[PDB]
Design a protein around this ligand. Sequence first.
Ligand code: A1H8I
Ligand code: FMN
Ligand code: ORO
Length: 366
Amino acid sequence: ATGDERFYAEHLMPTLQGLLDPESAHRLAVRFTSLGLLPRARFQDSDMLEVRVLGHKFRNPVGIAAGFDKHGEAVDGLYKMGFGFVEIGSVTPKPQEGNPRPRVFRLPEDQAVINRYGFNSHGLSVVEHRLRARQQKQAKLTEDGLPLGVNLGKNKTSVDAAEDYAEGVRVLGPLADYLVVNVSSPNTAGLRSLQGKAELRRLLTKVLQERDGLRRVHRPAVLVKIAPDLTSQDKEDIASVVKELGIDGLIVTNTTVSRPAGLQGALRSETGGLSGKPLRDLSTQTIREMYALTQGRVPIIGVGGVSSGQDALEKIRAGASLVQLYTALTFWGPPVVGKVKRELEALLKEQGFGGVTDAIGADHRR
Ligand SMILES: CC(F)(F)COc1cccc(-c2c(F)c(F)c(NC(=O)c3c(O)nn4ccccc34)c(F)c2F)c1
Ligand SMILES: Cc1cc2nc3c(=O)[nH]c(=O)nc-3n(C[C@H](O)[C@H](O)[C@H](O)COP(=O)(O)O)c2cc1C
Ligand SMILES: O=C(O)c1cc(=O)[nH]c(=O)[nH]1
């Protein structure tokens, strides 16, 4: 536990949260990061943390989830933070404003956040030109094991969900190492209910067909991102379509519209998606079903309440080849990346794993 770690957690972070509403704090976090105002990442990634999945090297499995850098403004500062991969978005075809403020709320007693941004996005065009300005720098980064994922969404007013997702595949597909069809946002009318078996099958057919129309070196992988609120019927059906259509992987899982017993924050009854520790195990259990339903054959990026190596390692052993975090960064600050990696590596060694790859799905073999 470094000096940066304890300093950012016990002093810097609680002071910023004391002066700043969460949306303001988010906006500043992005600026600082875009400018590279960040502490030294004194963790040097080891060979044990290397993962080869989705036709790519990841030099560590700890990524920043979608929603932090919605518009592509701080990608390089996030690699410098120490993440092994970066996912930007959600991006919607047309620019849109999102929900009226206030739309973000802290539950500090729960290590939790509730948000209803409602897909505030600069739009495909602005993000496309943003990413084009660094497209070749990113080609090198990918080669070095730091890939880039782009998360796609649809417009509030949009009439045909699949045409929104196809536009995104066409415009930002050539710039991404993987694309994410986000059919799980709680904050858009109709979006989570983008799994009507044959509905989801039709949407994902048009996405994969669009993706295959791109030139070989600009063909990303395509993932689906699902909610932790799914019935057992829904998960069985998602598993079925994913294997039928050859979907390249699953991101598990977006925030929850549930409110687990025991939440203590005053703001717990705010409308929106809950993230952080109340999501952790509900997240880990969805990795676990999805892995089993797909016979461990569909890569999974696990996400939900990860703030430590134990949290990351439980998700990997439950099926994840990669993990993401977001909420933990808003309490710990940048040092949380090095902290999770350092702890992940130590646990891998004590539990007898040769590396991350040996531990993927390990719980399903005990
Ligand atoms: C030189 C230096 F010392 F300044 C280096 O400091 C840094 C460097 C880099 C980043 C940060 C930084 C920060 F300033 C923050 F305000 C936040 N807070 C939030 O993002 C936040 C929150 O609070 N609620 N919330 C709810 C929803 C979404 C986001 C958030 C943060 F996550 C940060 F990572 C600080
Ligand atoms: C403020 C905020 C904004 C988010 N925006 C998006 C988004 O645009 N697209 C998406 O797929 N997930 C979004 N998420 C969900 C996260 O990507 C993630 O799935 C879940 O919050 C992360 O688990 P964790 O925050 O507990 O680490 C957002 C989450 C928060 C807290
Ligand atoms: O933009 C949002 O409000 C949003 C999107 C999403 O996928 N998840 C979330 O928690 N919020």
